[PDB]
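cache lookup: miss for this entity combination. No prior model stored, computing from scratch. Input as submitted by user K.M.:
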Amino acid sequence: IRGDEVRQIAPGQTGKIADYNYKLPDDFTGCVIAWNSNNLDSKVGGNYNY
Amino acid sequence: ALGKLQDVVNQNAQALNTLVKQLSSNFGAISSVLNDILSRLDPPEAEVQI
């Protein structure tokens, strides 16, 4: 996901991707994991395959 | 003269009147009316007030 929208993906919270793209149950149990990925995924000149 | 019977009716009615009147108090929440509490706040923050 884009960096600015990590903190919305949590049970109970909304947001455009949180609403129409991926949403968690408001009573979810488990863990959410995220980290910076420019090093392995992003390419010079613009990565648009996502 | 008919004090005893009157007292019985008065006490019972005063108890019912208090029980109904207590539905107007928010008890530390932000509104007595349940509908406002459910609507104004999103479901996961509405539940604690409810």
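stored under new cache key. The two ends of chain A are 9 Å apart (CA to CA).
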